[PDB]
Amino acid sequence: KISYSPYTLKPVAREGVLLKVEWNDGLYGFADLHPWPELGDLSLEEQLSDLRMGRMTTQIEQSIWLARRDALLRKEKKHVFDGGEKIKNNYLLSHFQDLKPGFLDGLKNEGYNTVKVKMGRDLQKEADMLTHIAASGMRMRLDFNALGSWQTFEKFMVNLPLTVRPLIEYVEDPFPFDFHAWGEARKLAKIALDNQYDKVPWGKIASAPFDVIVIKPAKTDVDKAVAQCQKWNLKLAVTSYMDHPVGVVHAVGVAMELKDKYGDMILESGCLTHRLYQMDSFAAELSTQGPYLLKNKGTGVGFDKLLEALTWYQLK
Amino acid sequence: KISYSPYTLKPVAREGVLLKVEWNDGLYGFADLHPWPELGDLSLEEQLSDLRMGRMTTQIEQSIWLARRDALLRKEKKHVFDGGEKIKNNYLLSHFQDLKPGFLDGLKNEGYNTVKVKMGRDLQKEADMLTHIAASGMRMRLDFNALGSWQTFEKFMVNLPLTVRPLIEYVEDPFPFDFHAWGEARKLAKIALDNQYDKVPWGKIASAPFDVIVIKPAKTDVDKAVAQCQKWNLKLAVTSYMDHPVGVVHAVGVAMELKDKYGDMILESGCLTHRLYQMDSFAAELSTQGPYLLKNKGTGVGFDKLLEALTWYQLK
Ligand SMILES: [Mg+2]
Ligand SMILES: [Mg+2]
């Protein structure tokens, strides 16, 4: 059985649904389904429409996989955080905010070590921002969302201040995937595979033309990504999907489990994104300590009372 | 001659008295006297006792000044709002009240621009409240009531998110007045001078170590405050005194007069506090339109029939 409860999130609007899944063994769990058509996903309406037709998107498959984890935990009355190792999240910096002097010091004192920055609009401006971050001694993650090009990327990197270069943990999707271009880009900085993941022919590559695999539990087959990481001796970073609090707790839960199991193979995550939306009933139950998402009350991903209080509509 | 009518206000129990003042020219007017011993005022009993013996607190002097304004208007058959420029008030948020999703968004849609928050109880509990205010895009006024410290205050400000910082209109009495400490505090945020007003050696300072002077018509010498604001090119904010509806209307009347006269020198007000108490006959006659206090029926501050219906006891 699959049932849903719709919701809308307002950026500081987006539509998604929470899912309640029930199995034969009498277990039931919860998960989130939050499509990002802007990133290439089928819309919420289309994914659910397709589901009725019998086809399940990989994103829905992940929602089910997550709901199962939640189900087993609620059964044994444990929280997804239990058994896992705490992990720090990076701070996402939006260039639509005037970096007040001393702010970086504000983040660092509270525990933050890394800042993720969207790159692409203005390289000059962005370069100046990276210099400020480097000046504070913090590490950084550059995300080009595959908009750049091999040439522009090279010129950009080579000309960055000597203080910046060492503090760039990695560059996500520098430009559209190309085996040779990515392989050569590695000479300038560690390269991370995020939105270009589906472009890699895993059963054909002779080696991995990247250093990090970004795993988003909401969309990525976790076991397969971990397998690839171990096969090629890479590192992995777990992120949320700018989704619902339920999706966020699920993501952190996965990250903490991986950190406990694989230690140094797991880098800091990027799941602290619930603050990107205006408070809803669920977000109200979440608390943070700097780069850490604290354990919320309840079992599974928590929100026991809130989830139990919802009217769930039969889906499939 | 001065006469009074006692009253109690019950928070959502405070004692105060309305005053009926008569002049040799035959005019008579009304005002409120509502002490806040919790804020340093002498008690109602003590102020009235001192009055009978020949001394008026500045608060009583203000009540008289207000009663005269009311008397003049009742003679002309005009309301205190007439000729003034309407002014927006901030919303006073309580920490003992849980925010509900969409509430702040709702206020913003009705015209509200700012939220006032009392700080001091719990910085964290309060800091999270500021994030929600920021998330709604509203400005905020923080009132520390001079309980902090130069040190305890600096730690706080630098930690506020890049979304919050630019949304802080100003901080009222961040800590006990000190010229140097306050001057340096201005670097972290604009500072408003409220309850520490009397600690400033006016005709002795070389410059003003604050950005805003808060005027409470119930106890501040208005002309004197305006003069200092003009002398140091500051800004002023007019507020009520968590007092009787009579006091509230009087305060808004002053704010509208100042706004019409000094325009941009006057910031949004903080007089919409009648809902802080359980309904009484006077509050029943007040209406609002979002952040605006609407013109109530009558002359002077209004409430003509209500005031005329009370039995007044001779005081002095
Ligand atoms: Mg990315
Ligand atoms: Mg104050």
Side-chain angles (χ1 to χ4, degrees):
Chain A
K1 276 192 170 65
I2 298 183
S3 294
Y4 80 97
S5 174
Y7 67 83
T8 57
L9 297 176
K10 302 180 182 179
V12 168
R14 304 200 62 75
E15 298 178 359
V17 305
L18 290 184
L19 295 175
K20 177 181 180 176
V21 189
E22 298 169 52
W23 286 264
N24 191 62
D25 47 49
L27 302 181
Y28 66 81
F30 307 98
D32 176 49
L33 173 58
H34 200 284
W36 268 83
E38 303 89 326
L39 304 177
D41 300 323
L42 294 174
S43 66
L44 178 63
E45 320 82 63
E46 193 159 358
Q47 286 195 47
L48 294 176
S49 176
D50 292 19
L51 184 57
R52 300 185 178 67
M53 174 177 87
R55 185 174 62 232
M56 189 168 260
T57 61
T58 47
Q59 177 164 27
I60 284 175
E61 280 180 48
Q62 278 306 298
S63 293
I64 299 302
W65 182 78
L66 293 174
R68 181 65 183 178
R69 287 160 58 72
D70 181 68
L72 298 179
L73 286 165
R74 287 177 191 282
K75 189 58 179 180
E76 52 195 59
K77 302 179 181 182
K78 294 297 179 182
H79 187 285
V80 71
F81 280 31
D82 303 329
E85 293 197 2
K86 56 176 169 56
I87 185 172
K88 293 189 171 184
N89 294 271
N90 55 45
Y91 171 69
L92 189 64
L93 179 60
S94 186
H95 278 300
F96 296 124
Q97 298 173 55
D98 294 303
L99 185 63
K100 299 274 187 176
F103 182 59
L104 297 181
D105 264 301
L107 300 170
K108 184 162 60 288
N109 292 312
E110 288 307 300
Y112 285 98
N113 292 310
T114 74
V115 179
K116 182 167 181 287
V117 179
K118 272 178 49 55
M119 309 290 292
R121 266 296 175 182
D122 190 48
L123 290 60
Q124 298 58 59
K125 176 186 176 183
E126 285 154 38
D128 291 307
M129 181 65 91
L130 304 188
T131 298
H132 296 307
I133 294 174
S136 70
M138 299 181 82
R139 284 190 291 279
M140 60 203 102
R141 290 167 175 184
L142 284 52
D143 194 338
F144 281 88
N145 298 91
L147 298 184
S149 67
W150 144 54
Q151 296 84 173
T152 55
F153 180 70
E154 181 177 358
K155 178 183 179 61
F156 179 70
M157 294 298 304
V158 179
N159 287 280
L160 284 172
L162 304 180
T163 54
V164 175
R165 299 300 296 282
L167 290 167
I168 294 176
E169 182 172 31
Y170 60 66
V171 180
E172 278 196 38
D173 310 312
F175 38 78
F177 189 68
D178 176 68
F179 198 90
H180 193 77
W182 276 49
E184 292 305 290
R186 294 184 58 254
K187 294 174 178 297
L188 304 173
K190 299 287 187 173
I191 303 299
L193 209 216
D194 180 29
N195 72 37
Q196 296 296 113
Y197 186 86
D198 299 323
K199 293 297 191 305
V200 182
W202 301 106
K204 181 173 185 174
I205 59 176
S207 82
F210 36 80
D211 304 284
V212 180
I213 292 175
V214 178
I215 297 183
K216 298 179 179 179
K219 297 266 310 304
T220 316
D221 180 315
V222 176
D223 294 322
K224 289 182 184 180
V226 169
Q228 299 161 338
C229 184
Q230 298 192 300
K231 171 180 179 178
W232 298 115
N233 183 48
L234 308 175
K235 293 293 194 302
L236 66 76
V238 181
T239 76
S240 63
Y241 198 53
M242 291 177 90
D243 45 346
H244 190 285
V246 167
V248 169
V249 176
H250 262 305
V252 174
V254 168
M256 292 177 69
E257 187 183 314
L258 293 184
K259 181 178 181 179
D260 177 61
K261 289 181 182 182
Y262 307 111
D264 298 299
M265 187 172 85
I266 316 307
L267 307 178
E268 298 191 342
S269 52
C271 303
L272 225 50
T273 62
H274 62 300
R275 298 182 177 300
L276 291 172
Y277 299 109
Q278 290 179 50
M279 180 186 83
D280 76 301
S281 177
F282 290 75
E285 301 304 303
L286 297 180
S287 299
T288 66
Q289 185 294 78
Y292 293 109
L293 171 62
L294 304 171
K295 179 183 181 181
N296 54 316
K297 300 186 300 301
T299 59
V301 287
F303 314 115
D304 297 42
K305 300 182 183 300
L306 299 183
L307 295 164
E308 202 297 303
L310 294 171
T311 287
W312 299 89
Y313 311 106
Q314 300 192 299
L315 187 59
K316 191 67 175 58
Chain B
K1 303 173 184 174
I2 303 178
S3 303
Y4 77 100
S5 176
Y7 69 75
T8 59
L9 291 170
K10 210 164 189 58
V12 174
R14 305 197 64 75
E15 286 178 345
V17 303
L18 293 182
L19 297 176
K20 174 177 174 180
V21 185
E22 300 170 53
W23 284 270
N24 184 63
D25 63 4
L27 286 64
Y28 65 92
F30 307 93
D32 176 46
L33 173 59
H34 198 285
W36 268 84
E38 302 92 326
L39 299 181
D41 300 328
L42 299 171
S43 71
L44 180 62
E45 170 177 43
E46 186 156 359
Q47 288 197 46
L48 292 181
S49 177
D50 294 349
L51 177 64
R52 300 196 182 73
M53 293 308 279
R55 184 180 62 228
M56 294 178 262
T57 50
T58 59
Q59 180 164 23
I60 289 177
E61 299 191 311
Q62 279 302 295
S63 294
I64 301 311
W65 177 75
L66 294 175
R68 181 66 180 176
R69 286 162 52 75
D70 178 74
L72 292 169
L73 293 167
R74 286 181 194 282
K75 181 64 175 176
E76 304 173 301
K77 298 183 192 302
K78 288 296 171 297
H79 188 282
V80 66
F81 284 18
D82 297 336
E85 186 172 309
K86 66 169 183 295
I87 186 166
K88 288 191 171 185
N89 293 278
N90 59 53
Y91 166 81
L92 180 64
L93 173 54
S94 171
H95 292 301
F96 305 120
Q97 290 170 46
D98 300 301
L99 289 61
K100 298 293 295 183
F103 176 72
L104 299 177
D105 183 66
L107 296 174
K108 185 182 179 62
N109 299 320
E110 299 302 62
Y112 280 98
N113 291 316
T114 111
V115 179
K116 186 169 189 295
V117 175
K118 181 199 296 181
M119 310 292 291
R121 218 302 70 170
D122 184 303
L123 288 176
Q124 283 54 57
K125 181 73 174 183
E126 293 158 31
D128 290 303
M129 190 163 271
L130 303 186
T131 70
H132 294 306
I133 297 173
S136 66
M138 309 184 76
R139 290 190 286 283
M140 64 201 90
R141 288 172 177 185
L142 282 43
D143 187 355
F144 284 89
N145 286 291
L147 292 176
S149 297
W150 172 65
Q151 299 168 54
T152 65
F153 176 67
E154 191 179 6
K155 307 180 185 301
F156 194 71
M157 297 307 288
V158 185
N159 302 179
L160 288 308
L162 286 179
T163 48
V164 182
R165 291 300 301 292
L167 289 176
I168 296 178
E169 208 191 330
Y170 58 68
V171 180
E172 277 186 50
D173 310 313
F175 50 82
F177 186 73
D178 179 79
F179 197 93
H180 197 79
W182 272 46
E184 293 303 284
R186 292 186 57 250
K187 294 181 184 300
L188 302 173
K190 292 194 176 180
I191 304 305
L193 196 247
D194 177 36
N195 68 49
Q196 296 296 104
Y197 188 86
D198 288 304
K199 303 299 178 59
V200 185
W202 298 104
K204 185 183 187 65
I205 58 182
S207 65
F210 37 74
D211 304 274
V212 177
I213 297 179
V214 175
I215 296 179
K216 291 154 296 186
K219 59 186 301 300
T220 303
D221 181 323
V222 186
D223 293 333
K224 180 186 175 184
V226 172
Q228 309 169 322
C229 177
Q230 294 179 301
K231 175 183 181 179
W232 306 101
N233 178 52
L234 304 183
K235 291 295 179 56
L236 68 76
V238 180
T239 80
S240 58
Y241 200 54
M242 305 195 139
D243 43 352
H244 192 278
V246 168
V248 167
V249 171
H250 262 306
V252 172
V254 168
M256 298 177 155
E257 186 178 311
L258 289 183
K259 186 61 182 181
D260 173 68
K261 295 183 182 179
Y262 303 109
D264 288 300
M265 187 170 85
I266 315 307
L267 307 175
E268 276 186 21
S269 293
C271 306
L272 225 50
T273 56
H274 62 296
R275 303 175 186 297
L276 289 178
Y277 299 100
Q278 291 178 46
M279 174 189 78
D280 80 300
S281 57
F282 285 82
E285 291 191 49
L286 295 179
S287 295
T288 62
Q289 183 293 286
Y292 297 110
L293 177 59
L294 305 178
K295 182 183 176 182
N296 55 319
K297 292 189 293 297
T299 57
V301 295
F303 315 112
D304 299 38
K305 290 184 176 62
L306 295 183
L307 297 168
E308 298 177 306
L310 295 169
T311 290
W312 302 87
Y313 312 108
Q314 298 177 298
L315 196 58
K316 188 64 179 59

Short mmCIF file of all heavy atoms in Angstrom, two decimals, chain B residues 214-245:
data_model
loop_
_atom_site.label_atom_id
_atom_site.label_comp_id
_atom_site.label_asym_id
_atom_site.label_seq_id
_atom_site.Cartn_x
_atom_site.Cartn_y
_atom_site.Cartn_z
N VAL B 214 14.15 56.60 21.30
CA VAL B 214 12.78 56.09 21.43
C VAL B 214 12.01 57.05 22.33
O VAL B 214 12.42 57.31 23.46
CB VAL B 214 12.77 54.68 22.08
CG1 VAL B 214 11.34 54.22 22.32
CG2 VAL B 214 13.48 53.68 21.18
N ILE B 215 10.89 57.56 21.83
CA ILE B 215 10.08 58.49 22.60
C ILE B 215 8.80 57.82 23.07
O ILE B 215 8.04 57.31 22.26
CB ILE B 215 9.65 59.72 21.76
CG1 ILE B 215 10.88 60.54 21.36
CG2 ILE B 215 8.66 60.57 22.55
CD1 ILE B 215 10.55 61.76 20.51
N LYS B 216 8.58 57.83 24.38
CA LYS B 216 7.35 57.28 24.95
C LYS B 216 6.59 58.50 25.46
O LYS B 216 6.95 59.08 26.49
CB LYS B 216 7.68 56.33 26.10
CG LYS B 216 8.36 55.06 25.66
CD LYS B 216 9.22 54.48 26.78
CE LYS B 216 10.35 55.42 27.13
NZ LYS B 216 11.30 54.83 28.11
N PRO B 217 5.56 58.94 24.73
CA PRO B 217 4.78 60.11 25.14
C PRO B 217 4.30 60.04 26.59
O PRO B 217 4.07 61.07 27.22
CB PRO B 217 3.63 60.13 24.14
CG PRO B 217 4.28 59.58 22.90
CD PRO B 217 5.06 58.41 23.45
N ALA B 218 4.16 58.83 27.11
CA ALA B 218 3.71 58.66 28.48
C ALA B 218 4.74 59.13 29.51
O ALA B 218 4.38 59.48 30.63
CB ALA B 218 3.37 57.19 28.74
N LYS B 219 6.02 59.14 29.15
CA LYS B 219 7.01 59.58 30.12
C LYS B 219 8.21 60.35 29.59
O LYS B 219 9.04 60.80 30.37
CB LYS B 219 7.49 58.39 30.95
CG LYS B 219 8.10 57.27 30.14
CD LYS B 219 8.42 56.06 31.02
CE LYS B 219 9.38 56.42 32.14
NZ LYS B 219 10.67 56.94 31.62
N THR B 220 8.30 60.53 28.28
CA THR B 220 9.41 61.26 27.69
C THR B 220 9.05 62.71 27.37
O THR B 220 7.93 62.99 26.94
CB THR B 220 9.86 60.61 26.36
OG1 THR B 220 10.21 59.24 26.57
CG2 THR B 220 11.07 61.36 25.78
N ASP B 221 10.00 63.63 27.57
CA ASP B 221 9.77 65.04 27.24
C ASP B 221 9.94 65.11 25.73
O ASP B 221 11.07 65.15 25.23
CB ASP B 221 10.81 65.93 27.92
CG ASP B 221 10.60 67.41 27.64
OD1 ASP B 221 10.20 67.77 26.51
OD2 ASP B 221 10.85 68.22 28.56
N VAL B 222 8.83 65.12 25.00
CA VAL B 222 8.87 65.12 23.54
C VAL B 222 9.71 66.21 22.88
O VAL B 222 10.60 65.90 22.09
CB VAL B 222 7.43 65.16 22.96
CG1 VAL B 222 7.47 65.02 21.44
CG2 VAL B 222 6.61 64.04 23.57
N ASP B 223 9.43 67.48 23.20
CA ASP B 223 10.20 68.57 22.60
C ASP B 223 11.70 68.40 22.81
O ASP B 223 12.49 68.61 21.89
CB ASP B 223 9.76 69.93 23.17
CG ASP B 223 8.34 70.29 22.77
OD1 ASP B 223 7.87 69.82 21.71
OD2 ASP B 223 7.69 71.07 23.51
N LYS B 224 12.08 68.02 24.02
CA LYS B 224 13.49 67.83 24.35
C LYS B 224 14.10 66.70 23.50
O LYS B 224 15.21 66.84 23.00
CB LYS B 224 13.64 67.50 25.84
CG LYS B 224 15.07 67.29 26.29
CD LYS B 224 15.13 66.82 27.74
CE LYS B 224 16.55 66.48 28.16
NZ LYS B 224 16.60 65.93 29.55
N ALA B 225 13.36 65.61 23.35
CA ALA B 225 13.84 64.47 22.56
C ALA B 225 14.00 64.86 21.09
O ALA B 225 15.00 64.53 20.45
CB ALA B 225 12.89 63.29 22.70
N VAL B 226 13.00 65.55 20.56
CA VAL B 226 13.04 66.00 19.17
C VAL B 226 14.25 66.89 18.92
O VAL B 226 14.93 66.77 17.90
CB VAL B 226 11.76 66.77 18.79
CG1 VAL B 226 11.91 67.39 17.40
CG2 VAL B 226 10.57 65.83 18.82
N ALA B 227 14.52 67.79 19.86
CA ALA B 227 15.65 68.72 19.75
C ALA B 227 16.99 68.01 19.69
O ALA B 227 17.88 68.39 18.93
CB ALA B 227 15.63 69.70 20.92
N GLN B 228 17.14 66.97 20.51
CA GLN B 228 18.38 66.21 20.53
C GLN B 228 18.52 65.41 19.24
O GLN B 228 19.62 65.25 18.71
CB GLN B 228 18.39 65.27 21.74
CG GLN B 228 18.06 65.99 23.04
CD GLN B 228 17.80 65.03 24.17
OE1 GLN B 228 17.18 63.98 23.98
NE2 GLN B 228 18.25 65.39 25.37
N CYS B 229 17.40 64.90 18.74
CA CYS B 229 17.41 64.13 17.51
C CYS B 229 17.82 65.02 16.33
O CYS B 229 18.52 64.57 15.42
CB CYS B 229 16.03 63.53 17.24
SG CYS B 229 15.92 62.63 15.68
N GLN B 230 17.38 66.27 16.36
CA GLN B 230 17.72 67.21 15.29
C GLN B 230 19.18 67.63 15.42
O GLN B 230 19.89 67.75 14.42
CB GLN B 230 16.82 68.45 15.36
CG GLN B 230 15.36 68.16 15.06
CD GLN B 230 14.49 69.40 15.15
OE1 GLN B 230 14.43 70.05 16.20
NE2 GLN B 230 13.81 69.73 14.06
N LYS B 231 19.63 67.84 16.66
CA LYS B 231 21.00 68.25 16.92
C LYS B 231 22.03 67.24 16.44
O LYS B 231 23.07 67.62 15.90
CB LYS B 231 21.21 68.49 18.42
CG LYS B 231 22.65 68.80 18.80
CD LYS B 231 22.82 68.95 20.30
CE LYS B 231 24.25 69.28 20.66
NZ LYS B 231 24.43 69.45 22.13
N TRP B 232 21.75 65.95 16.64
CA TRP B 232 22.68 64.92 16.23
C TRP B 232 22.25 64.16 14.98
O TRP B 232 22.80 63.10 14.68
CB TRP B 232 22.92 63.93 17.38
CG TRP B 232 23.34 64.60 18.64
CD1 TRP B 232 22.56 64.88 19.72
CD2 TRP B 232 24.65 65.09 18.96
NE1 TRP B 232 23.29 65.51 20.69
CE2 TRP B 232 24.58 65.66 20.25
CE3 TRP B 232 25.87 65.11 18.27
CZ2 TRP B 232 25.68 66.25 20.87
CZ3 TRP B 232 26.97 65.70 18.89
CH2 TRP B 232 26.87 66.26 20.18
N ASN B 233 21.27 64.70 14.26
CA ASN B 233 20.79 64.07 13.03
C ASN B 233 20.50 62.58 13.24
O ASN B 233 21.04 61.72 12.55
CB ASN B 233 21.81 64.25 11.91
CG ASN B 233 21.38 63.57 10.62
OD1 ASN B 233 20.27 63.78 10.13
ND2 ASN B 233 22.27 62.75 10.06
N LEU B 234 19.65 62.30 14.21
CA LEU B 234 19.28 60.93 14.52
C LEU B 234 17.89 60.66 13.97
O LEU B 234 17.37 61.42 13.15
CB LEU B 234 19.28 60.71 16.04
CG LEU B 234 20.58 61.04 16.79
CD1 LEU B 234 20.42 60.69 18.26
CD2 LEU B 234 21.75 60.25 16.19
N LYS B 235 17.31 59.55 14.40
CA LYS B 235 15.97 59.17 13.99
C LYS B 235 15.21 58.91 15.29
O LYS B 235 15.82 58.64 16.32
CB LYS B 235 15.99 57.89 13.15
CG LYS B 235 16.63 58.06 11.78
CD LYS B 235 15.81 59.00 10.92
CE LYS B 235 16.44 59.19 9.55
NZ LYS B 235 16.62 57.89 8.86
N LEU B 236 13.89 58.98 15.23
CA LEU B 236 13.12 58.71 16.42
C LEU B 236 12.02 57.70 16.16
O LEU B 236 11.51 57.59 15.04
CB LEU B 236 12.56 60.02 17.00
CG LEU B 236 11.47 60.83 16.30
CD1 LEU B 236 10.12 60.14 16.47
CD2 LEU B 236 11.42 62.23 16.91
N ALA B 237 11.68 56.95 17.20
CA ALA B 237 10.62 55.96 17.12
C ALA B 237 9.69 56.22 18.29
O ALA B 237 10.16 56.36 19.42
CB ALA B 237 11.21 54.56 17.22
N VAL B 238 8.40 56.32 18.02
CA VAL B 238 7.42 56.59 19.07
C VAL B 238 6.68 55.31 19.46
O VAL B 238 6.21 54.58 18.59
CB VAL B 238 6.37 57.61 18.59
CG1 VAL B 238 5.36 57.88 19.69
CG2 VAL B 238 7.05 58.89 18.15
N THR B 239 6.59 55.05 20.76
CA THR B 239 5.90 53.86 21.24
C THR B 239 4.93 54.18 22.38
O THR B 239 4.98 55.27 22.97
CB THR B 239 6.87 52.80 21.78
OG1 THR B 239 7.28 53.15 23.11
CG2 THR B 239 8.10 52.70 20.89
N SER B 240 4.05 53.24 22.66
CA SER B 240 3.11 53.38 23.76
C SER B 240 3.90 52.90 24.99
O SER B 240 5.12 52.75 24.93
CB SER B 240 1.88 52.51 23.55
OG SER B 240 2.22 51.15 23.40
N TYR B 241 3.21 52.64 26.09
CA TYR B 241 3.88 52.20 27.30
C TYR B 241 3.13 51.02 27.93
O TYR B 241 2.97 50.96 29.15
CB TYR B 241 3.96 53.38 28.28
CG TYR B 241 5.01 53.25 29.36
CD1 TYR B 241 6.35 52.99 29.03
CD2 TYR B 241 4.68 53.39 30.71
CE1 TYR B 241 7.32 52.89 30.03
CE2 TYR B 241 5.65 53.30 31.71
CZ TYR B 241 6.97 53.05 31.36
OH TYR B 241 7.93 52.96 32.34
N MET B 242 2.69 50.08 27.08
CA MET B 242 1.95 48.90 27.53
C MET B 242 0.95 49.39 28.57
O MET B 242 0.82 48.82 29.66
CB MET B 242 2.90 47.85 28.12
CG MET B 242 4.04 47.43 27.18
SD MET B 242 4.92 45.90 27.66
CE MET B 242 5.12 45.11 26.06
N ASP B 243 0.25 50.45 28.20
CA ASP B 243 -0.70 51.14 29.05
C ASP B 243 -2.16 51.06 28.61
O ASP B 243 -2.53 50.25 27.76
CB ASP B 243 -0.27 52.60 29.16
CG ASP B 243 0.18 53.19 27.82
OD1 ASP B 243 0.31 52.43 26.83
OD2 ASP B 243 0.42 54.42 27.75
N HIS B 244 -2.98 51.93 29.20
CA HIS B 244 -4.41 51.98 28.92
C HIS B 244 -4.70 52.47 27.49
O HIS B 244 -3.90 53.18 26.90
CB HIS B 244 -5.06 52.92 29.96
CG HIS B 244 -6.56 52.85 29.99
ND1 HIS B 244 -7.36 53.54 29.09
CD2 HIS B 244 -7.41 52.20 30.82
CE1 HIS B 244 -8.63 53.32 29.38
NE2 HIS B 244 -8.69 52.51 30.42
N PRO B 245 -5.85 52.08 26.92
CA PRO B 245 -6.21 52.52 25.57
C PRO B 245 -6.11 54.04 25.41
O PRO B 245 -5.75 54.53 24.34
CB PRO B 245 -7.64 52.02 25.43
CG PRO B 245 -7.58 50.70 26.14
CD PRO B 245 -6.78 51.04 27.40
#
